Paper text:
In the present work, we report the structural and functional characterization of the first thermostable archaeal dehydrogenase (AlDHPyr1147). The kinetic data showed that AlDHPyr1147 is strictly specific for NADP+ and is active with aliphatic aldehydes. According to gel filtration, AlDHPyr1147 is a tetramer. The AlDHPyr1147 subunit consists of three domains: the coenzyme-binding domain (residues 1–256, 443–470), the catalytic domain (residues 257–442), and the oligomerization domain (residues 122–144, 470–491).
Author numbering:
A (entry chain A): 3 to 490
B (entry chain B): 8 to 490
C (entry chain C): 2 to 490
D (entry chain D): 9 to 491
Amino acid sequence: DLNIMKVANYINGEFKEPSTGAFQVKTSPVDGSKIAEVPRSGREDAREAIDSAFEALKAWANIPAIRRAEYLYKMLEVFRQMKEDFMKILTVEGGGTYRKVWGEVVFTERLIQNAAELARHYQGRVLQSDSESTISVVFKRSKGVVGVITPWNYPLSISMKKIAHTLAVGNTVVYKPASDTPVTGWLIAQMVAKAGLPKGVFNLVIGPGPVVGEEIVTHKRVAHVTFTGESSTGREIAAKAAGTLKTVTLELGGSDPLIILDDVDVDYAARLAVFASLFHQGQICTSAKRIIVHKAVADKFIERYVHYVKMLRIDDPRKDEKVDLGPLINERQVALMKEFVDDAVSRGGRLLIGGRSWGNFFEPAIFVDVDRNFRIMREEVFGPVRPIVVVENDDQAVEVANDTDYGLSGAVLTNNVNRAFRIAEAVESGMFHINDVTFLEESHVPFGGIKASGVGREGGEWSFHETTYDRWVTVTLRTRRFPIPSAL
Amino acid sequence: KVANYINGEFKEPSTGAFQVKTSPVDGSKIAEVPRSGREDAREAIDSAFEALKAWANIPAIRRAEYLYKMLEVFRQMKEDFMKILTVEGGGTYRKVWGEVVFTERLIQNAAELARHYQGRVLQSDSESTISVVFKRSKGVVGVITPWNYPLSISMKKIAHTLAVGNTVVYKPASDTPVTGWLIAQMVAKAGLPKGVFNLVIGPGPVVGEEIVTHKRVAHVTFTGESSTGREIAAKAAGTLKTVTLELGGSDPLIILDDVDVDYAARLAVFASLFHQGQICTSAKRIIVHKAVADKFIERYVHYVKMLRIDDPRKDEKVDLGPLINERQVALMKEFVDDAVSRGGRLLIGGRSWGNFFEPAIFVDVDRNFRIMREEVFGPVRPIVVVENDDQAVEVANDTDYGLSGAVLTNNVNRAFRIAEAVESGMFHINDVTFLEESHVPFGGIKASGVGREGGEWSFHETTYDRWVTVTLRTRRFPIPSAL
Amino acid sequence: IDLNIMKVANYINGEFKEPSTGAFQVKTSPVDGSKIAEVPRSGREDAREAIDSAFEALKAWANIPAIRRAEYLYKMLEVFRQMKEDFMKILTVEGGGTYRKVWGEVVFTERLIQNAAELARHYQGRVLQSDSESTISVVFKRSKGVVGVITPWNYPLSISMKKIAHTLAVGNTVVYKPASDTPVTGWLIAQMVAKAGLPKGVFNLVIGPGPVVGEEIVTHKRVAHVTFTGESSTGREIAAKAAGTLKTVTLELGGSDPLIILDDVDVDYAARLAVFASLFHQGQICTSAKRIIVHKAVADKFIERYVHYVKMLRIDDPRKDEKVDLGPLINERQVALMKEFVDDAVSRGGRLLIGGRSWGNFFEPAIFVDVDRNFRIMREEVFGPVRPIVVVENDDQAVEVANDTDYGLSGAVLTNNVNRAFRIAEAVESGMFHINDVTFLEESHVPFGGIKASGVGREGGEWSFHETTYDRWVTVTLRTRRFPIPSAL
Amino acid sequence: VANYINGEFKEPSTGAFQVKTSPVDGSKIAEVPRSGREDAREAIDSAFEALKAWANIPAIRRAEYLYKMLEVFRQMKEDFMKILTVEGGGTYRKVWGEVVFTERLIQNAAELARHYQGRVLQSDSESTISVVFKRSKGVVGVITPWNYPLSISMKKIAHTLAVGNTVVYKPASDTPVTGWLIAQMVAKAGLPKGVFNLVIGPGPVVGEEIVTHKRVAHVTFTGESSTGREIAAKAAGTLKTVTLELGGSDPLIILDDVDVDYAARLAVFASLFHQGQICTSAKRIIVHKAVADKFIERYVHYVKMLRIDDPRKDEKVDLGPLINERQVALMKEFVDDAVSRGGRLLIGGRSWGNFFEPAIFVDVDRNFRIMREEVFGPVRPIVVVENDDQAVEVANDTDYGLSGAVLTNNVNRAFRIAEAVESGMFHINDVTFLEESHVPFGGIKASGVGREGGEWSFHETTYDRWVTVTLRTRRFPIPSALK
Ligand SMILES: NC(=O)c1ccc[n+]([C@@H]2O[C@H](COP(=O)([O-])OP(=O)(O)OC[C@H]3O[C@@H](n4cnc5c(N)ncnc54)[C@H](OP(=O)(O)O)[C@@H]3O)[C@@H](O)[C@H]2O)c1
Ligand SMILES: NC(=O)c1ccc[n+]([C@@H]2O[C@H](COP(=O)([O-])OP(=O)(O)OC[C@H]3O[C@@H](n4cnc5c(N)ncnc54)[C@H](OP(=O)(O)O)[C@@H]3O)[C@@H](O)[C@H]2O)c1
């Protein structure tokens, strides 16, 4: 419906343009074609949205949970009617294949539903008192106005996980989508508005991170920021947020290890590895970005892995439902992947396959004979350039897996219960998966990292933990003597 | 003479720089204590890091064993800790006795719970998938503490943090280093493996900042001034380390018209003025319903008048000892000087000699007085009269702080409605503002900080969740589609 | 729904059918004895067939992901939303409930189904610390198996659906036998389930006599658990019969809840509340305020205001309009029992302040003062509209009277004093207690249940889940070790 | 030896006694009470009188008592080990383990006493506070067996005491001195009178009186399934709840990828420790055909090495004697059936006095008594299976479902088998009788209901109590004529 409606901000129940009126033109990464004019908001716009959410907060937090749940179920109903719209935009604006965006839309449905389901069930605790005649309990309360700042790779699911769960437990929301995915953010507003949430409870401000996002992060009426993006941005936001003592949730990068032992079905290992390391062009935080394989099956693994990679079809992702890979999000991502490929070649790496690019498209590029000094070993490679590392034993497997600043997810493939468990215990990561892909994700599990991959957990009640606080309350039923004045 | 404790060894700071600490009671010398630098902090940090794996991997029952031994040791040093809390900290007998009893309970509480911190088994939305969540320790944890309750605050942090398999670098407040050194004495005698607990005595902005900015420190739990906390949270950003921040308070104590007024004044005096008002959850702003204010004010001032201020070493019946240092006396004078100049009525107190200060009580206060706007960490207190419960709440919430708070009343509806409406991390009906148990979530909102400490809440602060799955079936994948 | 058009049948393994024996009886309205429908009179073979159907379906139903059972329950919720007018009409004409009563039960039933659906994916086990090195130690939740659901006639929809929806949610299958006085409500439940398309045998309905059909369920070896709401005696018999095959039970038995009123209350408000709490659904509520206890200082004005509001209650054909206050008792036997209660009180010198008449199945609320502990209406559950008011001198006395009963389901105190409220809440012996509200407060996710003769276990949300699942400790050991025998080694 | 009722050691009301002898050589051990119903009634009435003051002190006081009881137990360790051997037939190593685990049980109960939490709920109603308290059930009956009399009794007693129930304890008639020593320990620990009561007597007399009494709120029982069914039915008269820890016939499944020698060594410990007289003994050994030959050879090899002797002679005795001659008779019955049905007796069968040499059978089928019944003694069948499906079918072909184990290195096979085997507990690559102080221990099917260990014990002997506070007034629907 972009052919009949202007893309706008959503502030205090109203779709409207930024106060300056300034806009930019969102183009498709597929063919550079125009998608829509979109707001280029500034600080006054963020402030208006923040004030709207702050003024809406008390009423929203004080209604019974069941009523917030009702609003989220209504949102879910609206989402279901809007699925194709979301799929269409995820593809032409974000470059996602039919399969990727179908996955994203199906998961988003589950996220909204999960948030609705859990709203009424987030519990506090009744405690024993060490004192006589004392009732001692612990309540759960909303943090307040919550800033939601998101990336471009899974813009729908990542945004809605944060928005629906944050809204469910009685916070209001100021939402700033990634500048490469603004129409997705706008469709989210369309959804919310049609679900008729009270004005100010949810607000959309479209504009630059360093301007609109920074305002959200430094404003005293914002209680908490939940953020998903680059670790460098996370560190910046964490620093900025300190000024007003607001808490943060930081879902940052990853360089996930996929560990492949010698007792596996090697053909299966390769099929799983291709999917985990290259789905959505590798632009996934929990992409299998460093493939680690036991020497005993390495030659056969490498051959199969490449075989299946050679079958990957790259095309305009609107062409049909069977396209494997779309383009990268912009030209900067292409240039960066060229730097990764060139650095790996210069250092003596063997390029097994791929390496061409055109427009924003970038082929899978696979390397062996890499060492720890390679950029594609030291940095997050948010794209389809992937190293394969050969190791002699499980000790080395772990050493390499852990030889990174990151610590989001990870996986081992093996049929041996002992090796599976020891490697799982020893790999330093927020999440781990035995015999599955690295990017496994469920709507209600604690999703998050350690080390440079961030802080906190999201999904279900973990999302609730991030944006509530505990409130110890006592009642004393007896009177007592006090120690001062002692002369009594 | 006092030393650091690093990797199982009591040792001098690497520069040998020492410093003479004195007693707030009479200026007489107490000890020679380290003046450590960044290099010392790093040595403790590297120790803790290298002890971490062995410490975290032993079964929890083992860590609990160490803590029970520590409890055993602590119980033998009770009077030592009491003496130093009085001599170095200026605490009265009753105050330090209370602190030593609470400390006994804190260490015991952490031992009790070590074996019992659980993860979760989850339902999977997928077929043939086991899906569970483990608890894992954060790593090496910096522990930075204040001077007012240096023993109990330090131990709640040290003991609970150790319990769940974290190693510790500890830096006590510069005015209470000997309390710190005794803590290391107790830990050493409990025989915890080397590097698991490290003490470094040095300046906050040098040693503390090293802990806060170091790459191998996973988490810092901190108690102190709100401004210090904001600084610490900002420095922590660089390494994405997490923080627990227990900062200031300006706790409201609300008194309604249906109370036992005499009882209310007795409660108010203890809550507002215990330990000379140098308590984070001290009742720092007293708020009273107009219908009982005159009688309440007369009674409160009457019991304040009965307070005995003296050398806390003299005997067990001393109500108030001195403030910790001359900077605190200077600050209290500012609060009084400001209140007088804004038209406050000074009902009693204000006398100060050396570090001693007689509780100064004000009425005819308005929201612009520094003693209404700022945390008053000492014995200077406003009483404010309100007309109804709405104004009581408005005044209670008219602060940047939000640590604790309390209401005195026999009406169930007024009590609950006021508990609910008051913006604080903790609240208490018919008791003091500074109630504290070993295992309850202790902490604030607004400028009073972030996180909760006490029992399993301390465990939450210094561990993380780790989602682990096992998939028991193989499946087909969407790429490549030509398959 | 046309009452003359209804073909009422069992629902077993996916199909509506007649009892194997072809037997039936006629269900009549308690309002005027009008025929409602012929309904099955099933026997043991029908119960066995349902049980076998539930058992055979168990593994496929338990092993699917929780999310898939929630989907079924959401679908059930969708169907129920369409069937509301139908459910309300049968609750009124078959159960004798007023419009306002049945509207309330249907609204609550919708919340109960939704609640079970919401929680299905979120019932968690535990990851534990091991005292042994190299050991992983966890606790899974597993469904109990086939569960028998045996229900009463007073709130037949909401009590049935609480039990059924939560039980199904966590992967048990169900064999359900409604109260013989409310069979059509059970049949409409099976219609809802059938329309929601649950797999065959997951839910079964058998309409028949408790001592026949009900007993087969309780004694059968393929039944893992029985959840039962009814009379304390029936419960005690069920608990005994269940021991044979070591199946567990949930027992929601009678109450005789106290409503304690202190001297500091708004007395007029206390009176209005007490009328509602003591007499809604003609007192036919387990958590009805069955023994009103008031403080001497407000007793006289309280009794005046309370009797005044009772006098205002409109007794009438509950089908007539929406504003009828009270309808008939469920049947003639209930009227006769209430007559015994009234007669025993009059005979013992109790003072009857109002009511005590009755016509057909309709009974006029009878209020007594000047009673003592030997009165039957103080010693027994009075499941109908006969209520004693006891006057007390102080809070200690209020508590002693409150606790002087074999029962222990719920309770309430009215007071504005936080200390008296909490101390009374603490001293009263009941599974549930409400400060400044009615005795029969109930939410979909709270633990509902009693102590003493009022039963065992709790229902509502995760507590229903606790009843019909078990904990399963599983360990993995990652190191080999030496063993102490043979020591020669 | 006497009863312990309301703070006093005393002989039975009737004065009736009996002589308990050693299973090892028949010699006299002690005279013990033969109590009757009046004794059980005196104990119950005492527990009941004592309940309210015990349930209402703070949890921390009860924990304190348990910590006291723990220190007494530590002093009494050798006395317990001695009696468990001479009265129980236990070897040194067995009774050492029992006492070591009993120490952990008492400690564990103490640790958790302060931490049993209720819940704060969201209300679907406005202005409503909704919470759930934990309340102790009341007077609790504790009825126990003879095979692990100390640890089994102490798990039940310690945890039941912790959360504020009082106890009436009737031990197994073949292990009464262990029950008396437990009353010694409790008395020395100084629990308030009536809180713990010991009544030594006949199960059908004393036990039944306990199970049927109005003032007993709950019964926790460990024993034979038939007994459990008896108790469950008698319990119904007073609607008291029960915990039933009944028999087991646990499967030990061995797959073809194991270290066969290790599997054999594990099986021998698992199947025959304490003469196989353990609920969770590996009583049905199931081995994959591809390693069945080697496994059976190694297994019999290690069984032959078992040294059977007077358990009092030294610390390296593997097996002592069965508890009484009736057990030996039952074991002969089991062997006589298996021989009659075509079983091959590979080793053992010999018996003298109460001693019995472990009898191992192969060529068995499902109709053998040693496959259909719990074999609570040293007769064990080995069954060979052709695949995992068949392993599970046999494993599940029993009325019992207590524990179970699989030995394998394949993650898939271990998990698939774990979830398929119908039991309350399951262990991968370990013995079937793993037990920790705080885990949920209990079975399904004929093996019992409920769970014991730490907070699971707490769930069994407490109830949830929903309480609300409604803060607003409202209009009610009747009388409808009322505005
Ligand atoms: N605690 C609670 O939550 C709660 C809630 C509501 C009501 N109640 C209690 O329910 C009671 C009134 O209901 P009611 O007259 O329906 O009670 P009931 O006579 O005990 O009947 C309850 C159910 O048990 C069945 N039944 C009867 N005998 C049986 C047997 N030997 N084996 C198995 N099932 C058998 C009945 O079938 P038939 O109809 O064929 O007899 C009925 O479906 C009151 O005491 C009330 O307090 C309790
Ligand atoms: N699930 C577990 O955790 C577990 C652990 C260990 C053992 N067990 C089981 O316990 C069984 C062997 O022990 P056992 O020979 O002592 O079993 P038992 O014959 O049932 O005796 C157990 C206890 O119940 C008492 N008792 C007997 N009849 C009673 C009655 N009618 N009412 C009340 N109490 C009565 C007994 O007293 P008297 O001695 O005077 O007869 C004894 O103290 C085996 O099945 C074993 O598997 C289970």
